[PDB]
Amino acid sequence: SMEQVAMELRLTELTRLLRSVLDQLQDKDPARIFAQPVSLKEVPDYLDHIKHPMDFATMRKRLEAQGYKNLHEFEEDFDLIIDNCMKYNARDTVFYRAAVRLRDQGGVVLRQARREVDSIG
Numbered sequence: 001s002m003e004q005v006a007m008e009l010r011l012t013e014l015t016r017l018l019r020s021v022l023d024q025l026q027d028k029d030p031a032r033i034f035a036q037p038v039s040l041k042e043v044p045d046y047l048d049h050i051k052h053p054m055d056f057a058t059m060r061k062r063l064e065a066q067g068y069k070n071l072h073e074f075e076e077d078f079d080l081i082i083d084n085c086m087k088y089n090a091r092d093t094v095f096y097r098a099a100v101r102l103r104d105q106g107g108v109v110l111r112q113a114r115r116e117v118d119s120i121g
Contacts, residue, residue: 008115011066011069011107012066013059013120014068014069014070014071014117015064015068017113017116017117017120018063018068019072020072020075021075021109021110021113022059022060023062024109025056025078025102025106025109026056026102026108028030028058028102028105028106028109029098029102031071031094031098031101033085033094033098034055034056034081034085034098034102035055035057035101036055036056036057036084037053037055037057038053038055039056042079046088049078049087049088050084050087050088052080054077054080054081054084055059055076055081056078056081059074059077059078059081063078070117071113071114071117075110078106078110081099081102082099082102082103084105085098086099086100087097089100
């Protein structure tokens with residue numbers, strides 16, 4: 001149907017905008033602390049602690065499969081990155097501090113992304 005195509009074009013345009021958002025969020029992590037999943041070889045207990053692990057590579061795979069239907073779903077995943085890290089790691093650690101910084105810096109990007117998604121439809 002033509003409707004299905006129009007819907008698909010919207011999904012594709014959302015995917016384009018989320019890719020740019022993702023790039024901007026990931027620039028706020030210059031140490032690459034959140035680049036890749038936490039290694040179960042190097043943190044064998046990790047899944048006892050964290051039930052839904054997340055990282056920027058895993059978000060990028062979902063993105064390119066057009067697997068985010070709306071900004072809210074994408075934000076959920078971004079928040080998992082931050083929130084997982086802040087539970088597993090103590091306050092006095094480079095990891096926790098990196099999450100706080102990513103959260104604070106990402107908020108700005110996400111604030112305008114919401115406006116753009118609402119605005120452009």
